[PDB]
Amino acid sequence: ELVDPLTTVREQCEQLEKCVKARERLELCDERVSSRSHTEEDCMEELLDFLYARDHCVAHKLFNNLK
Amino acid sequence: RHRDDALPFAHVAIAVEGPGWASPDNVALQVANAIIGKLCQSFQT
Amino acid sequence: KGFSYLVTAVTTVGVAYAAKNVVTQFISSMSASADVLAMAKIEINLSDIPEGKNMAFKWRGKPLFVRHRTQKEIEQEAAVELSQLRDPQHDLDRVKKPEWVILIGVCTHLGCVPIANAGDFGGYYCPCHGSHYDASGRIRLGPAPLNLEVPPYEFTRDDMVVVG
Amino acid sequence: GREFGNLTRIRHVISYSLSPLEQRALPHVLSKGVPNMLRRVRESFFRVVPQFVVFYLLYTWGTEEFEKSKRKNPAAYENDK
Amino acid sequence: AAVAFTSKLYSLLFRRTSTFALTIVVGVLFFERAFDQGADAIYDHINEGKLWKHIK
Amino acid sequence: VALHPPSYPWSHSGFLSSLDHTSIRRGFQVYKQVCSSCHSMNFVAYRHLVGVCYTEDEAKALAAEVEVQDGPNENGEMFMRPGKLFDYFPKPYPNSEAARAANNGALPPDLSYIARARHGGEDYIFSLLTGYCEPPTGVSLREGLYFNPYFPGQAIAMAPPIYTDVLEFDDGTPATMSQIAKDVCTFLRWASEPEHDHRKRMALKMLTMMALLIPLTYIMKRHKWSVLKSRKLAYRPPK
Amino acid sequence: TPMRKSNPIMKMINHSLIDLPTPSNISMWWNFGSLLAFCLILQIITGLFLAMHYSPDTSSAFSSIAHITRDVNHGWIIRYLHANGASMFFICLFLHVGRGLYYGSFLLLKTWNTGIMLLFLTMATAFMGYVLPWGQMSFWGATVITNLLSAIPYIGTDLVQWIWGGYSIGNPTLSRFFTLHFILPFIITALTMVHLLFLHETGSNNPCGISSDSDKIPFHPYYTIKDILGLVLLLFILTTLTLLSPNLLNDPDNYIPADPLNTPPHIKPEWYFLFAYAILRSVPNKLGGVLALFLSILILSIIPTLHNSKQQSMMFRPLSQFLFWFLITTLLTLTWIGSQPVSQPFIFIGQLASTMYFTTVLILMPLTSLIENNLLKW
Amino acid sequence: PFHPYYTIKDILGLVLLLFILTTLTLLSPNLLNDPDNYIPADPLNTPPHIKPEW
Amino acid sequence: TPMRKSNPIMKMINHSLIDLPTPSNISMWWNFGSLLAFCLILQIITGLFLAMHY
Amino acid sequence: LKTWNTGIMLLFLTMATAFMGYVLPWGQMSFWGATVITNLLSAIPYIGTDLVQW
Numbered sequence A: 001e002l003v004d005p006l007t008t009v010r011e012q013c014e015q016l017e018k019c020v021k022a023r024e025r026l027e028l029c030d031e032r033v034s035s036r037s038h039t040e041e042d043c044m045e046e047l048l049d050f051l052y053a054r055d056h057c058v059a060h061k062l063f064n065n066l067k
Numbered sequence B: 001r002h003r004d005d006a007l008p009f010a011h012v013a014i015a016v017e018g019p020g021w022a023s024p025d026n027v028a029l030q031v032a033n034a035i036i037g038k039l040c041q042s043f044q045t
Numbered sequence C: 001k002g003f004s005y006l007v008t009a010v011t012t013v014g015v016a017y018a019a020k021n022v023v024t025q026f027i028s029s030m031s032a033s034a035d036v037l038a039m040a041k042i043e044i045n046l047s048d049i050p051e052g053k054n055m056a057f058k059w060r061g062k063p064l065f066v067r068h069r070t071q072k073e074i075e076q077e078a079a080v081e082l083s084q085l086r087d088p089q090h091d092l093d094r095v096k097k098p099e100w101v102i103l104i105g106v107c108t109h110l111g112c113v114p115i116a117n118a119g120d121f122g123g124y125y126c127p128c129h130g131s132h133y134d135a136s137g138r139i140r141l142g143p144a145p146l147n148l149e150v151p152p153y154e155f156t157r158d159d160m161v162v163v164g
Numbered sequence D: 001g002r003e004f005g006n007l008t009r010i011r012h013v014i015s016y017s018l019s020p021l022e023q024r025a026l027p028h029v030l031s032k033g034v035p036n037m038l039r040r041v042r043e044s045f046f047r048v049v050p051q052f053v054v055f056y057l058l059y060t061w062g063t064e065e066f067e068k069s070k071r072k073n074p075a076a077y078e079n080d081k
Numbered sequence E: 001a002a003v004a005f006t007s008k009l010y011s012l013l014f015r016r017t018s019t020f021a022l023t024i025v026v027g028v029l030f031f032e033r034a035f036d037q038g039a040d041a042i043y044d045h046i047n048e049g050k051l052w053k054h055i056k
Numbered sequence F: 001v002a003l004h005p006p007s008y009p010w011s012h013s014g015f016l017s018s019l020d021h022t023s024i025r026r027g028f029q030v031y032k033q034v035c036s037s038c039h040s041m042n043f044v045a046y047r048h049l050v051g052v053c054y055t056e057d058e059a060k061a062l063a064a065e066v067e068v069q070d071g072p073n074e075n076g077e078m079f080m081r082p083g084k085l086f087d088y089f090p091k092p093y094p095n096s097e098a099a100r101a102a103n104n105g106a107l108p109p110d111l112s113y114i115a116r117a118r119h120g121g122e123d124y125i126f127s128l129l130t131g132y133c134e135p136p137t138g139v140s141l142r143e144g145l146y147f148n149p150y151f152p153g154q155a156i157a158m159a160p161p162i163y164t165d166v167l168e169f170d171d172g173t174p175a176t177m178s179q180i181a182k183d184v185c186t187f188l189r190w191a192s193e194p195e196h197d198h199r200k201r202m203a204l205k206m207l208t209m210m211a212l213l214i215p216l217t218y219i220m221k222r223h224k225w226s227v228l229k230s231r232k233l234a235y236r237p238p239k
Numbered sequence G: 001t002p003m004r005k006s007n008p009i010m011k012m013i014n015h016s017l018i019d020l021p022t023p024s025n026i027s028m029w030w031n032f033g034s035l036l037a038f039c040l041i042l043q044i045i046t047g048l049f050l051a052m053h054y055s056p057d058t059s060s061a062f063s064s065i066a067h068i069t070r071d072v073n074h075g076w077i078i079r080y081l082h083a084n085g086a087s088m089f090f091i092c093l094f095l096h097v098g099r100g101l102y103y104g105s106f107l108l109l110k111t112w113n114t115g116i117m118l119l120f121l122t123m124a125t126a127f128m129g130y131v132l133p134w135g136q137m138s139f140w141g142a143t144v145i146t147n148l149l150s151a152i153p154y155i156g157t158d159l160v161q162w163i164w165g166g167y168s169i170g171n172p173t174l175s176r177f178f179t180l181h182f183i184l185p186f187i188i189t190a191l192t193m194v195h196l197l198f199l200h201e202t203g204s205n206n207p208c209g210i211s212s213d214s215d216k217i218p219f220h221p222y223y224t225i226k227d228i229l230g231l232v233l234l235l236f237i238l239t240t241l242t243l244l245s246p247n248l249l250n251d252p253d254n255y256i257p258a259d260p261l262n263t264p265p266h267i268k269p270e271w272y273f274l275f276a277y278a279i280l281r282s283v284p285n286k287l288g289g290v291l292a293l294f295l296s297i298l299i300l301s302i303i304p305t306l307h308n309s310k311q312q313s314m315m316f317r318p319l320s321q322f323l324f325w326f327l328i329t330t331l332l333t334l335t336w337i338g339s340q341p342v343s344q345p346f347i348f349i350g351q352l353a354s355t356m357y358f359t360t361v362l363i364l365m366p367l368t369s370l371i372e373n374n375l376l377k378w
Numbered sequence H: 001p002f003h004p005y006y007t008i009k010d011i012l013g014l015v016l017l018l019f020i021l022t023t024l025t026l027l028s029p030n031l032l033n034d035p036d037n038y039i040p041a042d043p044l045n046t047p048p049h050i051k052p053e054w
Numbered sequence I: 001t002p003m004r005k006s007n008p009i010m011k012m013i014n015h016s017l018i019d020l021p022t023p024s025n026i027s028m029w030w031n032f033g034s035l036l037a038f039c040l041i042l043q044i045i046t047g048l049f050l051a052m053h054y
Numbered sequence J: 001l002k003t004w005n006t007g008i009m010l011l012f013l014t015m016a017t018a019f020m021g022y023v024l025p026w027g028q029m030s031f032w033g034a035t036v037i038t039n040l041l042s043a044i045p046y047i048g049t050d051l052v053q054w
């Protein structure tokens, strides 16, 4: 069995502050959209913000573990 | 160069450095001169 | 004066280097490309070629003659006096089996294709400027300077030959 | 037509020159050339630069505004239901 | 008086135009080879281990 | 709009850095065993692999593995033969209508210049290959689409193509998804721009030369212009 | 006499570039004409070579270029050189125009008018080369530029269909693009010779705007070595662009072959055109848009007519200089707007930039010239 | 002077050339034509009788 | 002066084929140069058209 | 002399042009004409065959 370094690197980056605030905003938006009866809103923008923030620091630290 | 476009004709002089009284070469040079000395009014070496 | 002229010398040397490289790579643009230079072999089945028949096959862009000679041709090609030739050569210098002869069907003068069983000599005749060949592919009359070219081959069966 | 024999009429101007092999090609750079370049920059600075500064401000503003326009407005879903 | 280097260089080589030209062709012959070799060395050295010439 | 890929530190991105040919060799196996099911590479032939990662004999060996149509024969009919160096990588479908029929209406593009035909280049592709995930709340996908934030629209027909141990490399490297992606990306870089290494090689030389020629010609100019640069005038009228 | 002056061909060469009297004091801004000529020559040579491998057929054009860049020996660098030389050509062209606007050399009427002709010809040529690869951007560029004549009210649609050679863009149009792109550069060459013939009857203007007949020097050796230096510099830049950073100006959407059924979401022409595109985008009316597009360049022809100043050059005219640089920034603004989607901020900014361009050329400069005159008391 | 004398003379010459050219183009187009160039190219066979343009 | 002689391009045209001094007595054999030029022009035009279909 | 020499140059150029147009239809005569005219440089003793192949 193999563990992909990308897993670990994501899990490590996701501990950082700039990730954490965006993650919290993502949870808030999930809660709104799930709680309503009938709406046209979706929770995508928040997800993209969080992913931009996280993949920034993944890119600085992933290739050191690859061949 | 001293320019004065009112004078009838242009005067010109051109030299290189010669060797002086003492050197032998003078003789040969004179011969050369005699060989050289139409376009213009007056000319000399 | 020396120093000032040394500068010019050095400048000219560099300019010459750059010019050579540019001009030469431009020139090498016009030579054969890396998709034109294939060189395959070709296999011919000999039991489809009757006696007296000259067959032409396309190979590397040019004709390839295979000729199945008769007995009187084998006889009369050997009689030739080699002193009366411009490219002297004996028939057995030009065949591996007497009853087969394999040639590159291109005229050595300027590249036209000789017609078979024509001319004064029973071999081939080139219409373009009038050169005659004998059934060994030897040049016998007309402006061509050399005999018809023989490629490398070998017999893999008494009915199969490979040219490569 | 135009030829070095009869371009114009001039009187009483004298010139003096040396040959190139008598003199230096880059005689005084840091003691004369540098200050000259500095004044040459000074004399044109305020005739050229501010227009480009204004261009830079306009560019950055317009970029920012366009990028704001693409973000979702909370009042578009929160206001009525 | 002072036989100096550039003066010898002027008087032997550069004074006559034909010989100047000959000097230039002779210099380019040797410059080309030296310069190529140096460049190829540097290039090869910058990325050792990644060129198929050596992996071969 | 689409998510902007981050910049990964690729070892070939330096001004004079060459490609890593080991990664090319592995990427090419990825493109055999996985990616040449859907996709064509119409502009590459086996002869192109010679001297890059294979000898001539071994490239002939690769060729030999594939059947190719040829003819007409002496009877006027077509037939099948083993491949040669001068044959192009084989197509997966005969025509684009058949390609659409086999992928629920979508058409997989040709990957011969994919790395030069997309914003971000190999940063994007890597991002796309590693980047699938489950959709946000409020989002839904029609029949046969996946979610991927790095695609324009975020809905993409292509299912996640790679995972850990979807193949095994012949050099013993561990085949984690990340490794596979990085290697196939290196290979697509090479497929899009073969002149890379030689180009950088050649830059060193002729740039050194053109840089050298500037001060020399500047000196010559200064020499010729010193006559005027030091000239002195005077005005002497009879007054 | 010397052989230099023994013979008509030789004596014309001599009057052109050996014993020609040139101003002593002209600056670097006067080097860009010779660089233009160099660029024309480079383009013709690299084009004649490319020509021998390209295929003017819609079913093989793309793949012929692939063949050139992959199988032809050093074909990739020949391609690179052609494409980058066009860019250099336009850089020099723009700088060359701007000089003359600043230093008042438009008062040489014949030279100026032949220059305008040359600008037009070069633009036509460049555009007809840009569509030959038959990529996705090339196709839609062709489409737009050939629909332009539909704006002519009575005869337009018929003109469009007569240029297409059919009901739509297709194989018959590509061969027309290629024949025209082949022939135009040589017409450009001939007209360049006429251009210089006209120039040498008067001689070069200079930075001060006053007559230089008291201080003329010969063209050789001074400007010969000066222009050689300029050429060396241009070659350094061109090589670095060709080998060290070839993809700087490149567009990915032209590495996708043409698809007549889909226009891509984001459209962008080659950089030296963006500004016209912006102008064309700024008018909410078809005919008016096209008219503005063409007037934007044709307006240069009346600059000599609107000249009020007693002095020729802007060297001594500061208000003028301020306006000049403001105009240049308006053009930069149009270039930037051309790159952006057709969305509201950029729509509004582009409209302002266009109105200010024409305003400035037609109104503000004449009036500042009058003010200036009054300040010097004449 | 060249004008008007040789202007009209050369115009007359041109009219004559056009008459001849039209008659050759429309009334007898096949006079100089060669049939062997209406057979496409075959790299394997040179025809027995060879003849260039006149 | 007349405009015929006011300007380099015009004056070259004039020296070429308006006020050029020609012999009075040259014959038909001197018409074939102008016909050569005509032929060159004809060839270029018809070729540019053919080119667009070949 | 000058006119005559430039005439000889023009003759040569026109012949080249005419021949290179004659091979464009790619008929049976065109092909073999091409072949012969491009083999002509094989007669150059030291460098000919390479010129032909280039």
Ligand SMILES: CCCCCCCCCCCCCCCCCC(=O)OC[C@H](COP(=O)([O-])OCC(O)COP(=O)([O-])OC[C@@H](COC(=O)CCCCCCCCCCCCCCCCC)OC(=O)CCCCCCCCCCCCCCCCC)OC(=O)CCCCCCCCCCCCCCCCC
Binding pocket: H020, H023, H024, H027, H028, I027, I028, I029
């Ligand atoms: C189905 C197709 C139909 C086609 C229809 C075609 C119709 C064409 C109509 C053309 C009309 C042209 C009109 C031009 C008017 C111009 C006026 C002018 O100023 O002229 C000045 C010009 C002369 O210029 P110049 O300033 O005097 O200078 C010239 C010399 O320097 C002067 O030097 P010299 O003075 O010393 O020279 C004196 C003498 C010199 O004399 C000699 O040298 C001696 C000659 C002796 C001949 C003896 C008879 C033959 C030999 C027999 C020998 C014995 C044999 C024994 C055998 C024995 C065997 C055993 O030369 C002459 O006098 C020559 C005069 C005759 C010229 C003929 C021109 C023929 C043109 C043919 C065109 C063909 C192409 C048409 C298109 C076809 C398309 C398919 O010409 C004239 O003066 C003559 C004008 C009239 C010419 C009429 C020509 C009619 C041709 C009709 C042809 C129809 C058949 C076509 C067949 C096609 C087959 C494919």
Ligand SMILES: CCCCCCCC/C=C/CCCCCCCC(=O)OC[C@H](COP(=O)(O)OCCN)OC(=O)CCCCCCC/C=C/CCCCCCCC
Binding pocket: G002, G003, G004
């Ligand atoms: C076999 C291998 C190759 C061998 C190559 C050998 C040649 C090498 C290069 C030599 C370059 C030429 C140098 C000498 C040029 C001399 C020119 C000359 O004498 O003419 C000057 C004089 C100047 O005119 P004026 O100003 O009126 O003079 C009045 C002075 N008060 O005359 C002129 O006008 C110039 C005339 C130029 C003639 C040039 C002749 C060139 C000959 C080249 C031959 C090349 C042969 C190559 C053979 C290759 C193998 C088949």
Ligand SMILES: CCCCCCCC/C=C/CCCCCCCC(=O)OC[C@H](COP(=O)(O)OCCN)OC(=O)CCCCCCC/C=C/CCCCCCCC
Binding pocket: D044, D048, G029, G091, G094, G095, G097, G098, G099, G101, G102, G207, G271, G300, G314, G315, G328, G331
């Ligand atoms: C690949 C992308 C390419 C993008 C486009 C590139 C081309 C456009 C470049 C724009 C920036 C150009 C900056 C040039 C340097 C400016 C330096 C400067 O301000 O110096 C001022 C200095 C002042 O000197 P004087 O007044 O003569 O007096 C001094 C002696 N006592 O020099 C000048 O003012 C000289 C000005 C000459 C003209 C310069 C023109 C620059 C722009 C030209 C192209 C613009 C677009 C086309 C315009 C015309 C359109 C119809």
Ligand SMILES: CCCCCCCC/C=C/CCCCCCCC(=O)OC[C@H](COP(=O)(O)OCCN)OC(=O)CCCCCCC/C=C/CCCCCCCC
Binding pocket: I002, I003, I004
């Ligand atoms: C709307 C439908 C189309 C209408 C077309 C109308 C025009 C019809 C054709 C008219 C042809 C021209 C005839 C008149 C020419 C007059 C030339 C003239 O006056 O100049 C002569 C004089 C001669 O010079 P010198 O020898 O120095 O004279 C000294 C005398 N001692 O000047 C010259 O040098 C010649 C100047 C030539 C000017 C020609 C102007 C041509 C104008 C054409 C306009 C066409 C408009 C078409 C519009 C189409 C629809 C949009």
Ligand SMILES: CCCCCCCC/C=C\CCCCCCCC(=O)OC[C@H](COP(=O)(O)OCCN)OC(=O)CCCCCCC/C=C/CCCCCCCC
Binding pocket: C015, C018, C019, C022, C023, F213, G221, G224, G225, G228, G231, G232, G235
């Ligand atoms: C291809 C990319 C190259 C990139 C590198 C930079 C390229 C540009 C470099 C500069 C090229 C300059 C070419 C033009 C000639 C310039 C000459 C010059 O500046 O010197 C002037 C000087 C004139 O002499 P004066 O002292 O004024 O008069 C003396 C009277 N008693 O010029 C001369 O030396 C003239 C004599 C001829 C010199 C040689 C001319 C060039 C050709 C020589 C080599 C011949 C072979 C060429 C083969 C090319 C490939 C097939």
Ligand code: HEC
Binding pocket: F034, F035, F036, F037, F038, F039, F103, F106, F107, F108, F109, F114, F125, F151, F155, F156, F157, F158, F159, F161, F162, F184
């Ligand atoms: C069949 C199961 C496929 C396999 C195996 C691979 N791909 Fe593919 N791909 C497939 C389809 C049906 C599509 C169309 C997607 C769409 O939305 O239309 C694609 C597309 C791509 C793209 C295009 C990305 C873009 O932005 O346009 C790329 C870059 C791509 N595919 C790459 C790729 C790679 C590297 C593969 C091997 C690891 C691979 N694909 C396999 C279908 C299939």
Ligand code: HEM
Binding pocket: G029, G030, G031, G032, G033, G034, G036, G037, G040, G093, G096, G097, G100, G105, G106, G108, G111, G112, G114, G115, G116, G118, G119, G122, G188, G192, G195, G199, G203, G204, G205, G206, G300
């Ligand atoms: C292919 C295009 C062109 C070429 C090859 C070309 C070439 C030249 C050359 C070699 C010169 C010599 C002086 C110099 O370099 O400054 C020149 C001068 C000049 N050019 Fe052009 N040019 C071109 C286009 C233009 C354009 C587009 C314009 C104007 C819109 C123009 C207007 C002028 C003017 C006015 C001068 C003389 C100005 C002066 O001497 O002060 N030219 N040109």
Ligand code: HEM
Binding pocket: G040, G043, G044, G046, G047, G048, G050, G051, G054, G065, G079, G082, G083, G086, G089, G122, G125, G126, G129, G130, G131, G132, G133, G181, G182, G185, G188
């Ligand atoms: C002023 C002169 C010229 C200019 C400005 C010019 C411009 C261009 C441009 C911009 C392209 C497209 C570049 C690309 O797609 O990357 C092109 C392509 C081409 N041009 Fe030129 N060109 C000129 C002269 C010539 C000449 C004289 C020929 C003679 C045949 C020629 C032949 C070609 C060919 C065959 C192509 C297509 C090949 C390719 O796209 O790489 N060009 N030209």
Ligand code: HEM
Binding pocket: I029, I030, I031, I032, I033, I034, I036, I037, I040, J003, J004, J006, J007, J008, J010, J011, J014
């Ligand atoms: C495209 C090819 C040619 C063209 C367009 C052309 C054009 C002309 C023209 C228009 C003339 C005016 C006088 C006249 O018509 O007789 C002329 C004269 C002349 N041509 Fe050419 N010509 C060509 C080829 C030749 C050739 C091949 C030669 C010689 C081998 C030649 C030698 C002469 C001479 C010597 C004259 C003047 C003779 C005299 O006036 O007595 N030309 N040419």
Ligand code: HEM
Binding pocket: I040, I043, I044, I045, I046, I047, I048, I050, I051, I054, J014, J017, J018, J021, J022, J023, J024, J025
């Ligand atoms: C002195 C000028 C010219 C001469 C002597 C000349 C001669 C010829 C000849 C003899 C042919 C073959 C005729 C045939 O096969 O029936 C030909 C074909 C052709 N030429 Fe011209 N030509 C000239 C100018 C041009 C020009 C400027 C072009 C410009 C594109 C051109 C384009 C073509 C084309 C496309 C063909 C092939 C079409 C065909 O064979 O009908 N020619 N030329």
Ligand SMILES: O=C1C(=C2CCC(c3ccc(Cl)cc3)CC2)C(O)=C(O)c2ccccc21
Binding pocket: G016, G017, G022, G030, G033, G034, G037, G038, G196, G199, G200, G204, G223, G227
């Ligand atoms: O560069 C030129 C120039 C000319 C030099 C030679 C060039 C040239 C270009 C190509 C060839 Cl094959 C030969 C010469 C063309 C431009 C010319 O005519 C002028 O009048 C002029 C005036 C001021 C500053 C520079 C110049």
Ligand SMILES: O=C1C(=C2CCC(c3ccc(Cl)cc3)CC2)C(O)=C(O)c2ccccc21
Binding pocket: H006, H010, I016, I017, I022, I030, I033, I034, I037, I038
């Ligand atoms: O036909 C000409 C001629 C010339 C007339 C105009 C021609 C011509 C050709 C084409 C055009 Cl677009 C314009 C003019 C060219 C030949 C010319 O220069 C001569 O010197 C001459 C001398 C004697 C007899 C005839 C002639």
Ligand SMILES: O=C1C(O)=C([C@H]2CC[C@H](c3ccc(Cl)cc3)CC2)C(=O)c2ccccc21
Binding pocket: G123, G137, G138, G140, G141, G142, G144, G145, G267, G268, G269, G270, G273, G276, G277, G280, G293, G294, G297
């Ligand atoms: O929509 C356009 C468009 O509008 C132009 C335009 C740009 C300006 C051009 C132009 C025409 C005339 C002049 Cl004098 C200058 C530029 C004409 C084509 C393009 O070049 C283009 C290229 C590729 C896709 C779409 C487009």
Ligand SMILES: O=C1C(O)=C([C@H]2CC[C@H](c3ccc(Cl)cc3)CC2)C(=O)c2ccccc21
Binding pocket: C128, C129, H050, H051, H052, H053, J015, J029, J030, J032, J033, J034, J036, J037
């Ligand atoms: O055998 C030949 C042959 O020999 C030539 C020859 C004719 C003369 C040509 C020629 C060359 C040079 C000049 Cl300066 C003049 C004519 C060259 C080709 C042909 O034109 C030809 C055409 C078609 C089939 C065969 C042939």
Ligand code: FES
Binding pocket: C107, C108, C109, C110, C111, C112, C126, C127, C128, C129, C130, C131, C142, C143, C144
């Ligand atoms: S080509 Fe055969 S005899 Fe000339």
Ligand SMILES: [Zn+2]
Binding pocket: F198, F202, G074
């Ligand atoms: Zn190289």
